[PDB]
Amino acid sequence: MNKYTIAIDLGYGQIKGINQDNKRVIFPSIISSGKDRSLDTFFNSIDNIVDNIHVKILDEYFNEKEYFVGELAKRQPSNSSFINRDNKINSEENKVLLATALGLLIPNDLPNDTKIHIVTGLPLEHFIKQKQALNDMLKDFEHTIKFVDHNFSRNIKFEESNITLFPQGAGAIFSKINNDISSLLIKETFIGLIDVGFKTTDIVVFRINKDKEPVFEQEMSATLDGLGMINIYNTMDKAFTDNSRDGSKLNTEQLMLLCEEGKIFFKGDYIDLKKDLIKARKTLSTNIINKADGLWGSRKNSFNSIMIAGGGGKVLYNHLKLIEPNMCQLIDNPEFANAIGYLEFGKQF
Amino acid sequence: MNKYTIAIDLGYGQIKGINQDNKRVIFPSIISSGKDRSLDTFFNSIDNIVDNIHVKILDEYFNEKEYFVGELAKRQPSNSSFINRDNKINSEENKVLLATALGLLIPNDLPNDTKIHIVTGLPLEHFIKQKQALNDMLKDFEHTIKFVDHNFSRNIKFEESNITLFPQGAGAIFSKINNDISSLLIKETFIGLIDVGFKTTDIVVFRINKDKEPVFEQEMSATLDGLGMINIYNTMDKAFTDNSRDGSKLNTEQLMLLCEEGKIFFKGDYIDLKKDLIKARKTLSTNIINKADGLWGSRKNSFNSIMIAGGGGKVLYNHLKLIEPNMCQLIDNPEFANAIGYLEFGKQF
Amino acid sequence: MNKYTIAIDLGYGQIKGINQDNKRVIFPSIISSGKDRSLDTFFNSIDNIVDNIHVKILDEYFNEKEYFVGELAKRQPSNSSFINRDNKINSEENKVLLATALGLLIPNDLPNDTKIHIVTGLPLEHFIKQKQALNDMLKDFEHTIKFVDHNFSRNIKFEESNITLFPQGAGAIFSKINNDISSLLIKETFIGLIDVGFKTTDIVVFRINKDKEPVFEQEMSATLDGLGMINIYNTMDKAFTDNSRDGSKLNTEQLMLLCEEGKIFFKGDYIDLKKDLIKARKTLSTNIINKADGLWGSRKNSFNSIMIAGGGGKVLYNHLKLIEPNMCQLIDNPEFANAIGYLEFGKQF
Ligand SMILES: Nc1ncnc2c1ncn2[C@@H]1O[C@H](COP(=O)(O)OP(=O)(O)O)[C@@H](O)[C@H]1O
Ligand SMILES: Nc1ncnc2c1ncn2[C@@H]1O[C@H](COP(=O)(O)OP(=O)(O)O)[C@@H](O)[C@H]1O
Ligand SMILES: Nc1ncnc2c1ncn2[C@@H]1O[C@H](COP(=O)(O)OP(=O)(O)O)[C@@H](O)[C@H]1O
Ligand SMILES: [Mg+2]
Ligand SMILES: [Mg+2]
Ligand SMILES: [Mg+2]
């Protein structure tokens, strides 16, 4: 029996994942306290399970705890922090989003021989430091998820020879383009992978050799600390205080709505803030281009094709084309590049 | 033939109802017992049928009891207590007020196979608490009504899959404005209905989505149970006992005459209580605004059009404009918002 | 002058004490030898006096014995028994624990002729059997205690008519909730309080009368000797030695850490005993289900609230929910449940 495989992304913009059977889930990194949903059931019947994940979690002593999670969490004004959310990998906030995307992707009642090979991700510089905090976490991981309003459960438990760790964007450029990168790579060319995340952006590059195989360069690749979408949400936060001049603060929902579209329905009116949206997209891309050439000296002329990824890279792409025009390009799925890049690369074993 | 529909509200200021054929009747929720009326029939023959509803109602054991009900029972001193009466839905005072609203709206020649889809309702916090008690009541509602001085007898009995249980304020804004409010709602706003009634104030809100479709907020919407127009009838009679200086109390007719005008006829004189009436209509409006704003934080700036309804919401519209000026609005029928909202949203069955 | 209030508990697991001004202490009930602490001062800060309890005790005949007690004594390998500690309530061990309890709670700058009223704890059967043994030893008390490395002594003396005696589980529901649950208690129910102590578990119920006052049932309430947290340390003792397969015994310290973690670090390795530790609490959870219904026939259905107490029940609340799910509930401070009741109900004088 071929043991199952689930690859998930432990991001902070939105939690991404995909199973062995190519079903993929996506939801923001937002939790909230769960409460009993019976009245709104009669109003709006829940068909999208992902939109309204109402969920209970058991543990080693059945210490039951319910959660509004996902879009259901984002509907709450009592939701997660999301502006100073936990960077510790062993937080319960990380435990919620990890266990939730399991039962979204585990098919019902798998055989016990067919256990699940989970392949997860870390930040590039933080792959070494927070490895044992997550290696201990995944080995200790033994719970029972309960789906409220959808009513199917998993006794989630994982061990070694099933848990698998890779940095952010490890097998995204090695595999999944593995038959198409062979035309790209010739001899001593430099491929580039840029995952524009929420908190940090990882620029990860491989060096191909005389034997046409990519070797890793930890000196041309690092974690751009504090550079991502979190600057754009912070900058557009101050633009609302500058335009409305009320001192009012947008919530978690309105500020994410602001940098998604540019127009917030404030006091019956669309406060138009579209001007500093694309200006922040240029300024973030300018921060990326300038910090691209920090690690990159004259080796930028050794490029064959740069790939970009991340949810931020999908909306930056025209201004993020200004790294290397007509050579840098977008990956097939900007969000899900790490997802299948952990999955088929995790299906190697 | 086709099964009929009669949409009535179990109102405690006045019973609000309208049938499938768009005939509507309305009467205060006051019952008495009944005695045969032939003396005043010679003086005042019944021109207004609703003004003088003497009613005889058989039951499943055919143990009939006579009842003065409505404006007639308001003219009776032997009427129900009605100001400290419970809102228990299977009580004897509710079987009379429901059936009296039936036979005024029941058209002639309804066969027994064309069972009336009575669209009943429960308040917003009471649609979970008091749902099975009306399932207790409507299953038990097996009676036979007879009108006095008009004399057409309707065999009143209702079963499951004919009866209908929507929340109060649910279909009043999900339907009945659904073709018009969608022109006003575009993106992630909150539409809301506040039914300021007699005992309860149903503040019910929806959240619309990107697709201009409302999802229900069960945490920004609640019933202000015990907060309504019954506090104004409570407040102003206390000011009259110190103004009359006899210690006497206005009864179930004169107290309704008191806060509706401000000046009660006492011993050849209309004793004035105009000053504290506006104070009663600000203090009630003080805790419909601020009690909604306990559920309405900074998402109140994302509101588009707050609707208000109810007979109390009809008469607070100057003071209840102070929820948010030039954003709040009154529905065209403050009485028949819920009843047509029962009816229009009861057309789906 | 005024006579102050200090409430302590003679819990065999850990002594739990509080003054009138709500400054409360907690430390395990283990003593050891007191030796010269000079060198440990220079390396590490002796800041928390609860962490570093080096104690000299003068007698009234001044024999001047010296003790490590509690947390520092827990780190001593030559400590007290604590798994077969003697049940003599008049022991010097109990005195040293009580003198340490009084020392951290008697404040400085207390006026000259002030004294303290003190409240103790007794098992509910042993409050009458073992009454005068403790009630003479508290009268016997006149000692001077010295806290090393903090430089303040306490000459502590008590007489008759200042000590006060109430048994275990008394004040936690007779007071401390009497202002709150009196809204909840109506007529002829029983409230529940389950103190999950270290050695003995406490079952106590109060009948409420018609007039909303608590009254006591001696045959619906008992003291569970031999039932409590102490069975779990006995169970996990052999559970390690059988799993060590060497006869290697944990110390007194790792014994306490074992039922707090289940993963003891041993010979450079985590010995995981999570299997038996889940079973042992459920073994204790089973043995309180049966003793509950031993005192509760159909009178279990005559409940309106069940509380639980004891430091063990804090990690057993969801696991002792199996008797009455959501009819049972949790006290605020499961350690300090008896003491705050002894604080509040001890304020009769
Ligand atoms: N359609 C979109 N419009 C605007 N921003 C988007 C869109 N899609 C994704 N994003 C941004 O991308 C981020 C998602 O990044 P993601 O690839 O999940 O990285 P991470 O792994 O760090 O979470 C979100 O925080 C969001 O701001
Ligand atoms: N013209 C009016 N003047 C004063 N008060 C009115 C008037 N019309 C209605 N009301 C008040 O509104 C209440 C009716 O509320 P209603 O919408 O029937 O709510 P409910 O469903 O709780 O009975 C009455 O009790 C009455 O005090
Ligand atoms: N955090 C914790 N983890 C595990 N066990 C605990 C914890 N806190 C308290 N306990 C257990 O509870 C006991 C304390 O019980 P306590 O309320 O002091 O009762 P007593 O009055 O009999 O001493 C300890 O022996 C300990 O085993
Ligand atoms: Mg990422
Ligand atoms: Mg109403
Ligand atoms: Mg105790």
Residue numbers in the entry:
A (entry chain q), B (entry chain r), C (entry chain N): 1 to 349
Anything the authors wrote about it?
Functional ParMRC plasmid segregation systems comprise an actin-like polymerizing motor (ParM), a centromere-like specific DNA sequence (parC), and an adaptor protein (ParR), which attaches a plasmid, via the parC, to each end of the growing ParM filament or filament bundle. Thus, the force generated from ParM polymerization is harnessed for plasmid segregation. Here we investigated the ParMRC cassette from pCBH, a 257 kb plasmid that carries the botulinum neurotoxin type B. This ParMRC cassette is also found on other C. botulinum plasmids, such as pCLK (267 kb) and pRSJ2_3 (245 kb), which encode neurotoxin types A and F, respectively. Despite the similarities to actin, pCBH ParM is a genuine ParM, since it has a closed β-barrel, a feature that is missing from actin and MreB structures.
Due to this complexity, the helical parameters were determined by cryoelectron tomography (axial rise 5.2 nm, twist −50.1°). These parameters refined to a distance 5.03 nm and twist −50.4° with the cryoEM data. Helical averaging of the cryoEM density, from each cross-section of the filament, based on these parameters led to a 4.7 Å map for the entire filament. The pCBH ParM filament has a diameter of 26 nm and of consists of 15 loosely associated, left-handed helical, single strands arranged in three layers in cross-section. At the center there is a single straight helical strand. This is surrounded by an intermediate layer of six interacting twisted helical strands that have the opposite polarity (antiparallel) to the central strand. The outer layer comprises eight non-interacting helical strands, which have a different twist and polarity (antiparallel) to the intermediate layer strands but have the same polarity (parallel) as the central strand. The 15 strands are in register in each cross-section despite having different radii and path lengths. The major type of inter-strand interaction occurs between complimentary basic and acidic patches on the protomers. Prominent in the acidic patch are two acidic loops (A1 loop and A2 loop), which adopt different positions across the basic surfaces of neighboring protomers in a lateral cross-section, allowing for multiple types of inter-strand contacts.
